[PDB]
């Protein structure tokens, strides 16, 4: 479905732009695909052999960027589609990168921490010439973390010198940026703020229902709460909580960190999490799974705004139903781009040799998200299209323009 | 097919974990190759390189410009080059690459631009001591000149980066004849073990192209009797020996084989089953199948073509009494002389053709001796002696390099 | 000494932290030691041969950094201690460097300016592949100066292109930073302000005695005076002056620029310099020699605060005595760090391709000095220790953390 | 014993005075081009950390890329590595191969480390010096405590940083571009050099009895080559014990015993002897093949051999030289007699650079050619300066380095 949704959005946007068929063919072909043998000794000395890989989709706008997944199931169509989508997404928010996606076909549950280190270092040895601060910047993904990136940094720097900017998502001690925890949820709020200004409204005039309460939902709920927004309902995997007068989100957060489930929180009524998406509210924010809005519940959605924080929460069936009802849907490719934008800031700070304080990180995040919204809005006017297509046409057109300007002669 | 590797793996008793590593390629690469056509419209192709193993040296192998690309065939071919270089003890591993395109669709200016863009996209992955490409289906010495010229912009003047070059740009002498002459060097060595010489024998030769012409020529000069030669149009037969010098002369005059008066035209389907001591398939593979294997008058088959001998015949032959010099060794004269080209280039100083053929004879002779010894150690036929030898050298090189990071 | 002080502080700090002994062993082994032949023709054509050297102690937190000494008496134990100290010091103030120290065993008085240039250039030819903008960044030291740095820059750049960030201490015209002359004395005053903020106090109306009146003391006294502080005593090697109402420091500096003697200044009374450290004041700032506070005068100190600007002005006996008297000692490794901090800023400005104005240098210096004090203070609470151990444990732990995150597999 | 660098510098001073070298040129030639000490920290097999310091001393490169081995031995320290690196500079000039001198090592006991720990240590050391070595820069090789397997690991790790580079190290396995003849080269060169010396007396290896200290790469192949030429090897020692037979030890049987993990003291074809008595054994020829400084003022007067062939580097210190000279003992110096190894290393490097290997007949033919030329040059130098063999070789090599240094010049 990453392939499904990305191909649907690409093909719609290509038709709106009237992209030349042969240019389109080139844009769908990855710059480079790499597979390398990664063999290490286990702690007891016996050999294990894996295949590492990196799909480098496009670099017309700058170095490639994307996660390293340590996971046993590798679908090449999915890896390829997510690298492509990162190319479009970086273009939507105007950060100077293209897309890439990589990983190792392994199960890290079966590897000791020393084996995981050796594996990471060997993988880095096999691809050091194909990545680089100005070439391809890896990041964490499923099965990898900031410790993984520290090992890439350390091994890479043997081949090319000290190079903090070669990976993002590093530990603070090795050049990681401040503000990364909050970046995605705070970015969702920044985007929502720019959207509501088009109506001369602000966060404080609105009620909100939030599906999911993890990294994205907690910080979004917090940033909404601090700006006057009333969060009337919140769900997660195990329950849901409701209050028409707004939930005290600071109290809810502290009830969470104390290991208290949503349903048995005092400042609200327990509700059925299956009712959250059709809950009475102005604004619905899916922050959990994709595919949650479809033909079966779209007609019962009450919000007038849907802020797509999760990946692909709205099926096309529901997209069309919801637009007809006049529902305004801020698309995922834009709305959840706070995380990737701050990872750009990490790279900048490393390149600059000089880290930013958190206030500057968040001022630049606000500036980037607001400008992207204005650019999306201007594209909707140009093409008389919805926000989702305003975004994809914006990102696709920037990649096409950069590609056409670079040209093709040898 | 993995049959030969699997057979040899079990003779050697290769460790399962080592075997798994040896089958995973070092690196597989695919790159976009987009060029403007002569009319400025774009065309996009995918170039690729499978770099199987470099335990024993830089990788080596052809670049195919051909539309049908099957990744499993490309991988098998890169792997076979790793074993084959090890059989004749030249310091390379195996690779194979290409561009999925039909060169007949492209002008020569378009093919040059495509070759140069491909080189631009892989220049950091190849190199004199990393991976050395060569011609293959759809490419030739002009293709290699373009790669050399473009690669040298990135890394300086680097003649050794490709083989099969034009002579004017560092190509070696002796390349035409290398494979067919190497076939005759290999069989001279084989027959030595039984106290016989080329002159002592009669030869039937299937095919009369780059391999067949040179093989028959070199046999004729060593006193062998060539009594039957096949090709596509016709065939000729003379049971006391064809005058090859004249048979070639007659080919230079667009002359067909049947029209050769120095013998009697025969049915080309009646060559593999012609009466002779030695049969040398030099045209197609899969010519010796189960049914037609019984109808074989020769006691020696020198495998010049690739896989001329179906695996059915391998069982039979041995029963019928036939000694099979296997293709992986017997036709390796061509790859051996491509190593010599590389050597001459990095030495900055070309050899004369006498030296090329001296070294070719030395390399083929030692490889046969190394193969025969292995056969005694493991007590196997010539095909497995060779495959065990090549696999074992790659395994040994890999084990000596080690596994720690 | 400077070797025994560093050893004693490293040792005490390592035991507060509980550093594993194998980790400690690694940390005290330098990354790399270099000795190179440096042979030049003298102006008359005859040869002279010297040994140049560079100890590169640690790079877990970033490129190495440190001075180049042209001096005949080379003690390897001292050079090594000074490289290690720089590793701890840069960590105390969160600058992204490790420590190094180098030099040439020569006497610059014996050498003409053209001989010194050729020697500098040959030394650069012999070590250029071992240093670098992201590898090891030299600086002036005893027997060298900004002109020496210009020659290193010029010769290095023949091998690597224009590389202004490869050395600090450069001439302004070749990328040197503004603000370097005031940096250490101003940094002392920023550090003092951060300390007194913890008591709800500002410098104004507090009284200061200052031992030494050179680069550090003059700028410290000026920065104090401009902030309303009362500088009631100043001494140097030739005399001392006092005024209980506060010396007009502007006038005193004007007097000293006319080569006037401290004891002769008209806006005060001559005093015996031996009575400075025991003068009646709120704040004592040793800005001259080390070891000036020992067991046989520590009991007669009357200040409540000591701001260590000189290297090791307080021996361990005095430390002991003054703690038991209730005296608060801001330690040298932190308090005089403004000079090393501004040399970091020079490197930043060079990397960024754009020099800062002086207001910006001083704003970032105040930010770095304040944040470092806040981190030290917090460390004192964590480990229940004094400011000196709070600073050393802070720097040593940052190096250890970075080393452990980087890991040990090859 | 005497400090190895004090000893070697004394020999350097004496040779400089024979040559009348300019004082400022002498001072420059003494000082090494580059000395490097690096931290080498690895996890052990159980995961715990151990830290060593590694050394690469690059003494002089006027005559070409620098050259010398890597020693893994507990006594490796800066003085020992500096002494060895300087001797490499003189020795490469003696045989006139286009190299300068370097040496490296790690203070460790390989006996105490597993094979995977030795591979990790070797790989980390290579990570720490890869930027200092190179085909045309500095070319290592195996010394005490290392072998061709160690070199394979250096080759493999180095090639990650600079691409496949067979000629970056010599002493490689044959499977990875090593030269036929290299493993046997130092022992065979010792025999070529000894035959040249004994011929000046009309004598042959078969006229002599031999005692050998050390039974590693040098001692084994030296014993084998002597044995195959009819020499009577009457005593052999190593670190664990020693064996003696006045009628001559069957060296082929001793090597088979060694191959089977047997100890010298247990070999049935001889009598166990105290290794501490090897150097004063009654023999015609003493060949030290182990550590340096082992002939000193404390035992030199008790040497009974009439010839000493220095297969080890710097086994005889200057005090012992004087004592032995007054006893009428002739010493074939390390800088000539043991140069077969670095000479065949040169051939290995040449073969790698040429991408085309030689057969063993050619290797050994060129080795004998180089050793013959050098002995004749040494003889001439002894006559010119009326000096002993050590100074004949030392001044030969020192003079060649000086000439090359003067040609290259001093401006920046
Ligand atoms: N594309 C991007 O760059 C990007 C960035 C960040 C997050 N996201 C998307 O945001 C979503 C959440 O990410 P996250 O980091 O917050 O995850 P997380 O794991 O931190 O939190 C997920 C939350 O969703 C809840 N949840 C899971 N299944 C649920 C269900 N069926 N009903 C209700 N609640 C459910 C969990 O209990 C938890 O509260 C995902 O779609 C993720 O892919 C996208
Ligand atoms: N593995 C290697 O490195 C290697 C090297 C060189 C050649 N070869 C093999 O050698 C064989 C021939 O190569 P070549 O260079 O001589 O080819 P070529 O194209 O120069 O000539 C091939 C000849 O085969 C003959 N021929 C073709 N179809 C025939 C048919 N149906 N019946 C009888 N004869 C027929 C004709 O004489 C034709 O000219 C092929 O199998 C090739 O793969 C292998
Ligand atoms: N570690 C660092 O990064 C760093 C940075 C700068 C300075 N420092 C320390 O600060 C000290 C002072 O530095 P500076 O640059 O101002 O030196 P400076 O040479 O500019 O001035 C030294 C001053 O001390 C006075 N003085 C010397 N001996 C004296 C004595 N016995 N009694 C009284 N006054 C005496 C001199 O007359 C002069 O006023 C340095 O020596 C060093 O200890 C440390
Ligand atoms: N390997 C070469 O090519 C080469 C070349 C020229 C010179 N050398 C010199 O030869 C000497 C030996 O080198 P190697 O390669 O044979 O080393 P190795 O590690 O292969 O063997 C050294 C031998 O010395 C023995 N030994 C160690 N300490 C001893 C002691 N105290 N008493 C007696 N025996 C002892 C060991 O047990 C072993 O038998 C060294 O001086 C070395 O520098 C080596
Ligand atoms: O091949 C070499 O470089 C080498 C190796 C070990 C010792 C020596 C030596 O001491 O000459 N030279
Ligand atoms: Na593309
Ligand atoms: Na283990
Ligand atoms: Na493999
Ligand atoms: Na260290
Ligand atoms: Na002059
Ligand atoms: Na020197």
Coordinates of C-alpha atoms in Angstrom, one line a residue, chain A residues 20 22-23 25-27 29-41 46-51 57 118 121-122 125-126 129-130 155 408-410, chain B residues 15 17-18 20-22 24-36 41-46 52 113 116-117 120-121 124-125 150 403-405:
Chain A
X20 CA 6.0 14.6 -20.4
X22 CA 9.5 10.3 -21.0
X23 CA 10.5 12.6 -18.2
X25 CA 9.7 7.4 -17.0
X26 CA 13.0 8.8 -15.9
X27 CA 11.6 10.1 -12.6
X29 CA 13.7 5.0 -12.3
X30 CA 16.0 5.1 -9.3
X31 CA 19.3 6.8 -9.6
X32 CA 21.0 3.7 -8.1
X33 CA 20.2 0.4 -6.5
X34 CA 22.8 -1.4 -4.4
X35 CA 23.0 -4.8 -2.7
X36 CA 26.0 -5.8 -0.7
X37 CA 27.1 -8.9 1.2
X38 CA 27.3 -8.3 4.9
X39 CA 29.0 -11.3 6.7
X40 CA 30.2 -11.1 10.3
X41 CA 31.4 -13.4 13.0
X46 CA 30.5 -18.8 13.6
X47 CA 29.5 -16.8 10.5
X48 CA 26.2 -15.1 9.6
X49 CA 25.6 -13.7 6.2
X50 CA 23.0 -11.0 5.3
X51 CA 22.3 -8.8 2.3
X57 CA 15.9 7.2 -5.9
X118 CA 29.8 -5.4 13.9
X121 CA 30.1 -1.4 10.8
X122 CA 30.6 -3.9 8.0
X125 CA 32.3 -0.5 5.1
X126 CA 30.5 -1.9 2.1
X129 CA 31.7 5.1 -1.1
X130 CA 28.0 5.4 -2.0
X155 CA 33.0 3.7 10.9
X408 CA 20.7 15.4 -19.9
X409 CA 23.7 16.0 -22.1
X410 CA 26.8 14.0 -21.2
Chain B
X15 CA 31.6 -25.7 5.3
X17 CA 28.4 -21.1 6.2
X18 CA 31.4 -20.5 3.9
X20 CA 26.5 -19.5 1.7
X21 CA 28.9 -16.6 1.7
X22 CA 30.5 -17.7 -1.6
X24 CA 26.1 -14.1 -2.2
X25 CA 27.6 -11.6 -4.6
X26 CA 30.0 -9.0 -3.2
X27 CA 27.9 -6.2 -4.8
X28 CA 25.0 -5.8 -7.2
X29 CA 24.4 -2.4 -8.9
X30 CA 21.7 -1.0 -11.1
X31 CA 21.9 2.6 -12.4
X32 CA 19.7 4.8 -14.5
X33 CA 21.2 5.6 -18.0
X34 CA 19.2 8.4 -19.6
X35 CA 20.5 10.0 -22.8
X36 CA 19.1 12.4 -25.4
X41 CA 13.9 13.2 -27.0
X42 CA 14.9 11.2 -24.0
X43 CA 15.4 7.5 -23.6
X44 CA 16.0 5.8 -20.3
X45 CA 17.6 2.4 -19.8
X46 CA 18.9 0.6 -16.7
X52 CA 30.4 -11.6 -7.5
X113 CA 26.5 8.6 -25.5
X116 CA 29.7 7.2 -21.8
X117 CA 26.7 7.9 -19.5
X120 CA 29.8 8.0 -15.7
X121 CA 27.4 6.1 -13.5
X124 CA 33.6 4.7 -9.0
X125 CA 32.7 1.0 -9.0
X150 CA 35.3 8.4 -20.5
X403 CA 36.1 -12.3 8.5
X404 CA 36.8 -9.8 11.3
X405 CA 36.0 -6.2 10.6

